[PDB]
């Protein structure tokens, strides 16, 4: 069936992406899906369903569901917002209760969704390729989104780990992700790895995929109202429905994955895992270890020789294409783990204070830096820079640029103690910058504060990126960090800890860094989300 049908009504508005590029995105995401399933697919599905059979899921109350709403979640077309939802205002609660009643009473009627162009910031790259068109966001009304949480919040936050075990990427800190990847690479006699890029994953998700996904959820022990809501949400919302623009006009019809529903992340992970695990069998890949984050997939296996590995990747791709997951860029076998990019990241090596070889996740800093510059220039509720400092804390660029830059601004504005909103792959947090040392030690290890002897390629990538962007060189950042370190230490308390742990790299006469006294429960900085709510 067609992933999308359009009426002609434009995707109207509410470098940076706008509605002016939506037309180009529509062309890319609009195609017919031809899915052919086989025994391997059926076999993996039964195996996944047998694991889901062990899960018991709770049905959340309206209030518990309200308390999980992102503070910045899009407003309801029925006179209430995320603030009203989080405060349990009578208008919000009463409207949500009537939505819930309709989900239990009406099993067929498609639920309306809003189609919108995403405003994302990317960097002005005129060399190998041009600009990117805006992504398309599809979401139901706020009321429906609170109802999804009642029926499925417990499912989506318990089922994936039960079904996929160690293959489920979202259960990991960046430190645990590198450990998993390195351990899996070390455990192969002759390792080979590859990342699989699916072209427009959301668009490739068929009605059958969404029904197979529901067949997995149905395996949980569920409250009857939860069982009916999952059934009603599958037919009325998840499989597809009408698209309405910002001006309230009939835009078209969706028959694929909506990006803004609670099950997007869980569903894409399950669907990606199922197709990939079945494709590994069809390709006859030996001893696979997979890691799945939504549509993002890495496979690590035993090499069967250079030519044989090229042929097995073609068979993997053939199988994925049959399952309705065609490639964007054709996968390539890699025989060095650093060369694989997964979750926009790659493993690199450095050394800690003791001289020990340590592995960490890094990426091209262009996008993180350009996004941080934009945030410095304009008022933004979500601070991608804080997310980036937290997730890439061991990197040369997050340590020397982002940490130095933001701690200097925060010291100057007297805002070190001010809690900031932070979104990481749909999990919302509220973090005071003064608490960053303890968080970094939990997420990455004590070594994140003493990494040095970075790879030359990595050093060159940061240095070339700064030149390209007009950012002062690393020498300027070292000077600037010595200043910030001095003003932080002079303050004592948490500010001194920041100075000590975060900026030890900037000094010639380094301090010996021991485990932090305040280290640890992360879901304490938790406020809303876990890959679902707006
Ligand atoms: O010794 C040498 O050989 C080199 C010396 C040298 C070269 C350039 C400077 N620049 C500056 O002092 C100023 N800018 C900066 O000191 C600056 C700081 C952060 C900057 C960022 C990001 C970095 C990550 C955090 C957010 C800010 C960008 N740009 C920055 C410029 C350059 C810029 O203007 N915009 C962008 C655009 C995209 C990406 C990055 C940038 C301050 C006022 C005058 C301009 C200073 C010294
Ligand atoms: C390229 O490398 C990668 C490494 C890990 C990942 C996967 N991990 C994450 O996306 C984050 C956010 N998480 C999510 C997200 C979606 C869903 Cl469905 N479920 N959980 C919880 C677990 N992690 S986490 O990193 O452990 C963490 C925990 C507490 C924090 O709290 C505080 F902010 F306070 F630090 C902050 C971070 C993805 C990429």
Curated annotation (Swiss-Prot):
Necessary cofactors: Mg(2+)
Domain of life, per lineage: Viruses
Chain ranges of the RdRp catalytic domain: 191-309
Membrane topology of this protein: Single-pass type IV membrane protein
Compartments where located: Host cytoplasm; Host endoplasmic reticulum membrane
Binding site for Mg(2+) 2: 197, 295-296
UniProt feature coiled coil, ranges: none
Positions where Phosphoserine occurs in the chain: 19
Swiss-Prot/TrEMBL catalytic activity: RNA(n) + a ribonucleoside 5'-triphosphate = RNA(n+1) + diphosphate
Binding note for cofactor: Binds 2 magnesium ion that constitute a dinuclear catalytic metal center.
Activity regulation comment: Activity is up-regulated by PRK2/PKN2-mediated phosphorylation.
Post-translation changes: The N-terminus is phosphorylated by host PRK2/PKN2.
Function: RNA-dependent RNA polymerase that performs primer-template recognition and RNA synthesis during viral replication. Initiates RNA transcription/replication at a flavin adenine dinucleotide (FAD), resulting in a 5'- FAD cap on viral RNAs. In this way, recognition of viral 5' RNA by host pattern recognition receptors can be bypassed, thereby evading activation of antiviral pathways.
Listed name of the protein: RNA-directed RNA polymerase
Organism: Hepatitis C virus genotype 1b (isolate Con1) (HCV)
């Amino acid at each position: 069936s067609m992933s999308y049908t359009w009426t002609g009504a434009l995707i109207t508005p509410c470098y940076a992406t706008t509605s002016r590029s939506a037309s180009l995105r529509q062309k890319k995401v609009t195609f017919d899906r031809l899915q052919v399933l086989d025994d391997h697919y059926r076999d993996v599905l039964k195996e996944m369903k047998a694991k889901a059979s062990t899960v018991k899921a709770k049905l959340l109350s309206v209030e518990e569901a309200c308390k999980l709403t992102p503070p910045h979640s899009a407003r309801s077309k029925f006179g209430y917002g995320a603030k009203d939802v989080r405060n349990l205002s009578s208008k919000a609660v009463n409207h949500i209760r009537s939505v819930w009643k309709d989900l239990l009473e009406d099993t067929e009627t498609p639920i309306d969704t809003t189609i919108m162009a995403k405003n994302e910031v990317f960097c002005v790259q005129p060399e190998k390729g041009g600009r990117k068109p805006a992504r398309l966001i599809v979401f139901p009304d706020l009321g429906v989104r609170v109802c999804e949480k009642m029926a499925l919040y417990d499912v989506v936050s318990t089922l994936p780990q039960a079904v996929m075990g160690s293959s489920y990427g979202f259960q990991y800190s960046p430190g645990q992700r590198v450990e998993f990847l390195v351990n899996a690479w070390k455990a192969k006699k002759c390792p080979m790895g590859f990342a699989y890029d699916t072209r427009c994953f959301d668009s490739t998700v068929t009605e059958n995929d969404i029904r197979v996904e529901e067949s997995i959820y149905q395996c949980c022990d569920l409250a009857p109202e939860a069982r009916q809501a999952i059934r009603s949400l599958t037919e009325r919302l998840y499989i597809g429905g009408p698209l309405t623009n910002s001006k309230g006009q009939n835009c078209g019809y969706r028959r694929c994955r909506a990006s803004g529903v609670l099950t997007t992340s869980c569903g894409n992970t399950l669907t990606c895992y199922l197709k990939a695990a079945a494709a590994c069998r069809a390709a006859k890949l030996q001893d696979c270890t997979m890691l799945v984050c939504g549509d993002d997939l890495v496979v690590i296996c035993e090499s069967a020789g250079t030519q044989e590995d090229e042929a097995s990747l073609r068979a993997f791709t053939e199988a994925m294409t049959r399952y309705s997951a065609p490639p964007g860029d054709p996968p390539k076998p890699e025989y060095d783990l650093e060369l694989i990019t997964s979750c926009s990241s790659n493993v690199s090596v450095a050394h800690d204070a003791s001289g020990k070889r340590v592995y960490y996740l890094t990426r091209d800093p262009t996008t993180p830096l350009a996004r941080a510059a934009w945030e410095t220039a304009r008022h933004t509720p979500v601070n991608s820079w804080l997310g980036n400092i937290i997730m890439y804390a061991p990197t040369l660029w997050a340590r020397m640029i982002l940490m130095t830059h933001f701690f200097s601004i925060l010291l100057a504005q007297e805002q070190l103690e001010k809690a900031l909103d932070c979104q990481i792959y749909g999990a919302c947090y509220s973090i005071e910058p003064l608490d960053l040392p303890q968080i970094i030690q939990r997420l990455h290890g004590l070594s994140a504060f003493s990494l040095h002897s970075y790879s030359p390629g990595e050093i060159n990538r940061v240095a070339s990126c700064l030149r390209k962007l007009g950012v002062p060189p690393l020498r300027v950042w070292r000077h600037r960090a010595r200043s910030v370190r001095a003003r932080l230490l002079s303050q004592g308390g948490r500010a001194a800890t920041c100075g000590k742990y975060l900026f030890n790299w900037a000094v010639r006469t380094k301090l010996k860094l021991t485990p932090i006294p305040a280290a640890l429960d992360l879901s304490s900085w938790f406020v809303a989300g876990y890959s679902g709510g707006d």
